[PDB]
Enzyme design. Structure first.
Site, PDB file in Angstrom:
ATOM      1  N   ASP D  45       0.825  -1.203   0.000  1.00 59.03           N
ATOM      2  CA  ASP D  45       0.000   0.000   0.000  1.00 59.03           C
ATOM      3  C   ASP D  45       0.860   1.255   0.000  1.00 59.03           C
ATOM      4  OD1 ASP D  45      -2.584  -1.122  -0.113  1.00 59.03           O
ATOM      5  OD2 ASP D  45      -2.534  -1.569   2.037  1.00 59.03           O
ATOM      6  N   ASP D 147      -2.605  15.588  21.708  1.00 61.41           N
ATOM      7  CA  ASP D 147      -1.467  15.331  20.835  1.00 61.41           C
ATOM      8  C   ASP D 147      -1.729  15.733  19.392  1.00 61.41           C
ATOM      9  OD1 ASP D 147      -0.641  14.261  23.194  1.00 61.41           O
ATOM     10  OD2 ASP D 147      -0.093  12.289  22.400  1.00 61.41           O
ATOM     11  N   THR D 158      -9.027   2.248   7.538  1.00 55.56           N
ATOM     12  CA  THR D 158      -8.309   1.040   7.917  1.00 55.56           C
ATOM     13  C   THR D 158      -6.886   1.317   8.371  1.00 55.56           C
ATOM     14  OG1 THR D 158      -7.532   0.658   5.664  1.00 55.56           O
ATOM     15  CG2 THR D 158      -9.657  -0.265   6.266  1.00 55.56           C
ATOM     16  N   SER D 163      -6.196   3.008  14.248  1.00 51.94           N
ATOM     17  CA  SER D 163      -5.374   2.975  15.452  1.00 51.94           C
ATOM     18  C   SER D 163      -5.899   3.905  16.536  1.00 51.94           C
ATOM     19  CB  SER D 163      -3.928   3.348  15.118  1.00 51.94           C
ATOM     20  OG  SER D 163      -3.478   2.683  13.950  1.00 51.94           O
TER      21      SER D 163
HETATM   22  N1  LIG Z   1      -5.553   2.213   3.853  1.00 56.08           N
HETATM   23  C1  LIG Z   1      -4.760   1.441   4.479  1.00 56.08           C
HETATM   24  N2  LIG Z   1      -5.243   0.511   5.261  1.00 56.08           N
HETATM   25  C2  LIG Z   1      -4.375  -0.302   5.939  1.00 56.08           C
HETATM   26  N3  LIG Z   1      -3.048  -0.099   5.749  1.00 56.08           N
HETATM   27  C3  LIG Z   1      -2.650   0.875   4.948  1.00 56.08           C
HETATM   28  C4  LIG Z   1      -3.486   1.622   4.308  1.00 56.08           C
HETATM   29  N4  LIG Z   1      -2.786   2.452   3.589  1.00 56.08           N
HETATM   30  C5  LIG Z   1      -1.531   2.198   3.787  1.00 56.08           C
HETATM   31 BR1  LIG Z   1      -0.132   2.992   3.055  1.00 56.08          BR
HETATM   32  N5  LIG Z   1      -1.450   1.235   4.616  1.00 56.08           N
HETATM   33  C6  LIG Z   1      -0.416   0.476   5.208  1.00 56.08           C
HETATM   34  C7  LIG Z   1       0.973   0.883   4.830  1.00 56.08           C
HETATM   35  C8  LIG Z   1       1.997  -0.103   5.354  1.00 56.08           C
HETATM   36  C9  LIG Z   1       1.452  -0.823   6.511  1.00 56.08           C
HETATM   37  C10 LIG Z   1       0.553   0.117   7.319  1.00 56.08           C
HETATM   38  O1  LIG Z   1      -0.556   0.639   6.567  1.00 56.08           O
END
Ligand SMILES: Nc1ncnc2c1nc(Br)n2[C@H]1CCCCO1
Ligand SMILES: Nc1ncnc2c1nc(Br)n2[C@H]1CCCCO1
Ligand SMILES: Nc1ncnc2c1nc(Br)n2[C@H]1CCCCO1
Ligand SMILES: Nc1ncnc2c1nc(Br)n2[C@H]1CCCCO1
Lengths: 261, 261, 261, 261
Positions: D45, D147, D158, D163
């Site tokens: 990604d 923060d 996602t 998080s």
């Molecule tokens: N939309 C998304 N959903 C889940 N993961 C995503 C993401 N877009 C990205 Br870039 N990532 C990845 C990058 C490397 C690993 C962490 O997240």
């Protein structure tokens, strides 16, 4: 000495149960389920829970052992394959003992009832809204409006406590922890939101505002209590005594249960 | 005896500071900011924090007092209006003392550095991704991928710890608490998610996987540390000593700060 | 035209109810609680909820208005002091209408039952453990073990949905949201944890694993359903129609209810 | 037609990249990295993210495809083993297209800067405390102290959004979502706590109170911005266009990434 063995009822645990009794006859071990000095449960943490909630009038005279016929447990932390070596070291003697803190629960109304909980005690409503005033050492702390509350022992933090966002507490810390359930907060009502950890001697009291019927749980047990005037949560003076041989750290037991075994 | 007074710098705190010194001359109290037996801070918890992080080489020889010129504080829990009665009871003697636990932080690389934290110590990355292995008493517990981690003292649970979903701990419990920051969990990575509370002597170690530069904070202080091989979190042997007169329970101080004063 | 007025039953709301009917006689407004074109509720969001769950067989032929005799409500967003100006503009005509999305709930067993929910529909267990398989558009998504689940409408995100950590959704978005209750996660069980928002036409199905009895709620209503084979959550084709005059943005209504009014 | 291929740089992706170009010569496909009508990224990604943040001046003239040489990705949702069948169906034509919503970010100070984000845009402080006023459609909603904040696209729920406790949104919903980072709440400060989902045309504005320097991220990119007067979050008018063949539902992609593949 005197011992007894609890079983989960299935074919795996009863067969494993009879193999320890047969090996127990090879040593100086008398079977006694009325006055045992060693309680051994075989099954899961639920089987251990029942074995605790059965001899809880002599907790300071028993050392419990838990064996897990299924997955690893937090109290049943012995694999079935290590049953033979257990009986040998169990029937000898001179083992180390381990004590975990407990949670006293007092209910005042028709007298007043008292309960010991190995995991946690939770309070909900009888059907309508759950509203209680929370008094901490005679001081009104907050008015809770939600689904209920849950006070957990240290070793019980891994159980329902963990599902409610609470912290995992090492059981060498004599303390209790309170967690909230779907607390509604707005311009009107205000709960702390955070979990609260109370040391020994600290007394947490719940008092009703309108509804005086609360569905209260003590570990697996759960009863609807009518005409309740107060609930008293407090770290118990009694401790559950474990028998130990090899070291199985609580943190490793937490690692295997949630991260990876 | 010897004393000194810290101030927030504004006009309200300096005027309140000089009025205690003037009244102090009426008793047997010598002013000394090099070897005081009584540290008095005037302002907020931040002013108290600095007063702590200034005499932290003689913590077992000082009793601190905190006055809040603004809102109530968790360490500055004395109203300015009660300053005169403070000096009278402070200059007499025979007051009760109170000790809170502290958090030792060891950093290993260029030697090895050690820090005491009244509130908490937090760790982030230097810029890229934050990945660390979490070892608990020589045992690899988890591999954390996220924004960072935060280890909090009991009295520091009300501060950053509370913002991260951690539990509020009564400061009579000698323990430390670890909380996660935006931990990413998926089919690959796995963090515990729950906060963890460690008793005395329990050692939590963070170890790098790739990046060996971590922006580390110790209470208000914050430094970027290069070529880090290990971070050691551990309940400190030293305790901060408070001077007390009237009783102000931590739970009431929690009630006033978040529910309603 | 035809109208009717719901009341909370107390002395404040009934007096305010009769003052609108008396002023209604001054205009061309016929009272009719069997076929009203305007439903006006007086009390709180609970009073509005009942007024909705009473004329829900003609939702596309009624424009509702809610007045709050107590605190501000999310559906009863009109102060009692503005009742007279309401009747004047209500009895005239040529007002703007506003529609909010709804949540269809299908229960399959003894036929199959269907429900409309203005706020949310929640599912719990009959007494034992709550375990369900979660199918999303014919695809098994997860197996949920916990206290229950809650599917919320957009305007219902401010209610139970908010207590469970869900997001607040603007009601112009035709979507539904699913939230978890005390989901237990370990090495065995695995829930997503995050709330899920489904667009129109998206169908979420809950299916039992062992226990086929679930205590199901539809807004205020709540019934224990026996021998359940499936529950179907789906954004409804019907929308609740509101009557509006002045603009009261949902975000301002969220600000007043939780931040400060 | 015209196409180009992005690669992760390692030996696995470059070899897989050259095998599609070689097969592309067998059809009527011209290679062009200045004016491609088909962008194909190979890696993760992150590789897809860079390929997006490179041709983002012609988003309405390109259909992207993502291949994952490692684990499954949310944009790189094609296994390497299915590369040959991709080139065949890609070089033919008559494929279905798919568009996802985007998030416009406006920064006002030295002119005013504008950014498109496929995942999210986050705001932190320059070093000290992060305090901002949150205005929603010209209306002051809250004052955030913590923060930072994070506004996420639907397909970006996602990622960092997840998080921070936010909800997972189906990308067919044209909306944006705001999530909080370690928000401190007390008797003084008050944040909503809940995540907020805004529909199209809804404008969310952040305004500084004291510090006018904010470390702002736009997907992977991150810059410290000086003398900031306003930040504008808003659902973008432009959409990213995907090329699709077989159906891979977002919910199945969520299942494989977090539950089990
Ligand atoms: N939309 C998304 N959903 C889940 N993961 C995503 C993401 N877009 C990205 Br870039 N990532 C990845 C990058 C490397 C690993 C962490 O997240
Ligand atoms: N302390 C504990 N920690 C984790 N799990 C515990 C537990 N006590 C019990 Br019983 N359990 C088990 C029972 C069956 C599975 C669910 O929880
Ligand atoms: N222990 C504590 N509990 C709560 N607040 C604390 C704190 N210590 C400090 Br410093 N603070 C204050 C500083 C200024 C306002 C934010 O937090
Ligand atoms: N949508 C909503 N948002 C916020 N509150 C709502 C609500 N719907 C109802 Br009913 N309520 C009220 C009822 C009484 C007080 C608790 O919640």
């Amino acid at each position: 000495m005197k011992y007894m063995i609890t079983s989960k009822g299935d074919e795996k645990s009863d067969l494993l149960r009879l193999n320890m009794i047969a090996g127990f006859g090879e040593y100086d071990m008398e079977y006694d389920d009325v006055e045992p000095e060693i309680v051994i449960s075989i099954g899961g943490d639920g089987t251990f829970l029942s074995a605790f909630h059965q001899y809880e009038e002599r907790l300071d005279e028993i050392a419990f052992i838990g064996i897990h016929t299924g997955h690893l447990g937090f109290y049943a932390d012995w694999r079935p394959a290590e049953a033979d070596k257990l009986v040998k070291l169990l029937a000898k003697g001179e083992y180390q003992k381990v004590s975990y803190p407990l949670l006293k629960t007092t209910v005042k109304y028709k007298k007043e009832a008292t309960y010991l909980a190995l995991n946690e005690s939770t309070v909900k409503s009888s059907g309508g809204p759950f509203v209680v005033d929370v008094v901490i050492n005679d001081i009104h702390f907050e008015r809770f409006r939600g689904d209920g509350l849950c006070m957990s022992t240290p070793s019980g933090t891994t159980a329902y406590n963990k599902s409610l966002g609470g912290a995992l507490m090492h059981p060498s810390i004599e303390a209790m922890q309170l967690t909230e359930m779907a607390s509604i907060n707005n311009r009107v009502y205000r709960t702390i939101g955070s979990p609260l950890v109370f040391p020994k001697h600290h007394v947490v009291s719940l008092q009703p505002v309108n509804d005086k019927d609360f569905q209260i749980s003590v570990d697996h047990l759960s009863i609807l209590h009518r005409d309740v005037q107060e609930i008293r949560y407090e770290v118990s003076a009694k401790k559950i005594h474990f028998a130990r041989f090899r070291s199985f750290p609580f943190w490793r037991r937490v690692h295997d249960s949630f991260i990876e075994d």
